Amino acid sequence: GTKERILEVSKELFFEKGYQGTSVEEIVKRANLSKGAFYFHFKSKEELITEIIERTHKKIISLFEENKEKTPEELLEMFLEVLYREKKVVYIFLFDLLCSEKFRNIYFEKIEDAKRRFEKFLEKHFPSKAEILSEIILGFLRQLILHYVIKEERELPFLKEKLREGLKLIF
Amino acid sequence: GTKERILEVSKELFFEKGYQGTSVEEIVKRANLSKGAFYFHFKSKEELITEIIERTHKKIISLFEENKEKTPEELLEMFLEVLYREKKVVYIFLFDLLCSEKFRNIYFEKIEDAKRRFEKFLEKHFPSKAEILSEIILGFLRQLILHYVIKEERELPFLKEKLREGLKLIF
Ligand SMILES: [Mg+2]
Ligand SMILES: [Mg+2]
Ligand SMILES: [Mg+2]
Ligand SMILES: [Mg+2]
C-alpha cells in the first residue's frame, strides 16, 4: 500500500544521497503523494528511517527463526543472501546510522541483537566456542560486505564463494 | 617540533568533534600558534588529516616489517596493541574517512594495503589459506575494535583475551 510505497521511495533516495540530504518533500514528490499521506503513516523523518531498519531487522529475526535447524554454514549462506538482497538498506545502516551521532545506538543495538541470536544458535552444538565463533564470523561477514558490496559491488556468487571457504576453514 | 604539536592537537580535536566540525582556526588557537605556522607545515586541512592517517599507517608498515618472523598470533597481538595505542586515530579513520564521501577512498586504500601485507606474511606458511585467513582475521579484528574500542571503550587486556582465543581457534 501507500506505506510500502513511501518506504520503497525513501530507501531509494537515502541510498542515493543519504538521510540528511533527503527531505520529506523530495520523498513525497517522487512518490506522487501529499504530505498528509506521508504524515498519516510516519510522524517524522526519524520514524521513517527507524521503520526501514526495523523491517530489515525483522527479516533477519525471521531468518534465524526459520532456519534454526540448518548447519551453521547453511544458516550463514542464507544470512548473506538476505543481506545482499537488502544491500541498499545495509548501505543506509552504515552511512546513515553508524556514521551518525544521533542514530549510532540503533546500529549497535541491531548488531548486538543479531549477535545474541547467532550466539544462541551456536550454543547448541559448540557451547564452549559459540561466543568466540560469533565474533569471528560476524567480523568476517562484515569484512566481506564492506569490501565486496560497499567498496565495490561484486555479484553474489563471489561473496558466497568467499564465505563458504572461510566458514569451511573455521568449522 | 611544531609540526608534531599541530598533529597532536588536530588528532585531539578531530577525535572530540570530527574533521568537518573542526577549523584551522580552532587548531591553531588550541596550539597557541599563528596561522602562518600552520600553513608553513600544511597547505590545507586536507593535507593535515591525510598526514595523520599516513603517520599511523607508517607505524603499521613498520609493525609488519619488524615482526615478519613472529607467529601469526604474536604479530596480530602486536597489531592490536598498536591500534589500541592509536585508538583516537582509529576513531578518526572510521568517522572522518569511511563515513565521508571525499575521503572514503583513503580508508579503503589503507585497509587494502594492510590486507596485502598481512596476506604476504601468511603466504609463507599457509599459502593455500592466506587469502581466506586474511579476510577472516581482518574481519574479526575490525569486529573487536568496533565493539570494544568504538562502541564502548574496554581496556586492552579484554580485547587481547578475545583476540587470543579467536586466533587459537582459527589456527
Ligand atoms: Mg547451500
Ligand atoms: Mg542458497
Ligand atoms: Mg605474546
Ligand atoms: Mg604483548
Domain ranges in chain B are 1-49, 50-171
Integer Cα distance of A107 and B45 in angstroms:
30
Contact B141, B163 (CB under 8 A): yes
Q: Residue B131 corresponds to which amino acid? A: E
Instruction: Name the grid cell of B146.
Output: 568496533
How many CB atoms sit inside 10 A of residue B159's CB? 21
Resolution in A: 1.5
Instruction: Name the grid cell of B37.
Output: 605556522
Chain A contact residues (CB < 8 Å to B) = 95, 98-99, 108, 111, 129, 132-133, 135-136, 138-144, 147, 151, 162, 165-166, 169-170
Distance of CA A49 to the CA centre of its chain: 12
Instruction: Name the grid cell of A112.
Output: 548486538
| DSSP run (H or E) holding A14 | helix A2-17
Integer Cα distance of A132 and B54 in angstroms:
32
Q: Residue A121 corresponds to which amino acid? A: F
Distance A77 CA to ligand 1 centre (A): 7
**Architecture label for domain B50-171:** Orthogonal Bundle (1.10)
Tell which residue, B100, B16, B105, B113, has the closest CA to residue B56. B113
User: Rounded to the nearest 5 degrees, what angle is found at the Cα of B146, between the Cα atoms of B144 and B152?
Assistant: 95
Closest-CA residue of A relative to B132 is A166
Would you call A154 exposed, middle or buried from its count of C-beta atoms within 10 A (0-12, 13-18, 19+)? middle
Contact A96, A19 (CB under 8 A): yes
Would you call B109 exposed, middle or buried from its count of C-beta atoms within 10 A (0-12, 13-18, 19+)? middle
Q: Was B77 annotated as part of a binding site? A: yes
- Structure determination method: X-ray
User: What residues contact residue A34 under an 8 Å CB cut-off, 6+ apart?
Assistant: A28
Integer Cα distance of A20 and B150 in angstroms:
23
Integer Cα distance of A93 and A106 in angstroms:
9
Q: Which residues in chain B touch residue A170, judged by CB atoms under 8 angstroms apart? A: 136, 169-170
Instruction: Name the grid cell of A49.
Output: 528511517
Q: Which of A133, A135, A143 sits opposite B135 (nearest CB)?
A: A143
Would you call B1 exposed, middle or buried from its count of C-beta atoms within 10 A (0-12, 13-18, 19+)? exposed
CATH number of B1-49, picked from 1.10.10.60, 3.90.1170.10, 1.10.3720.10, 2.40.50.100: 1.10.10.60
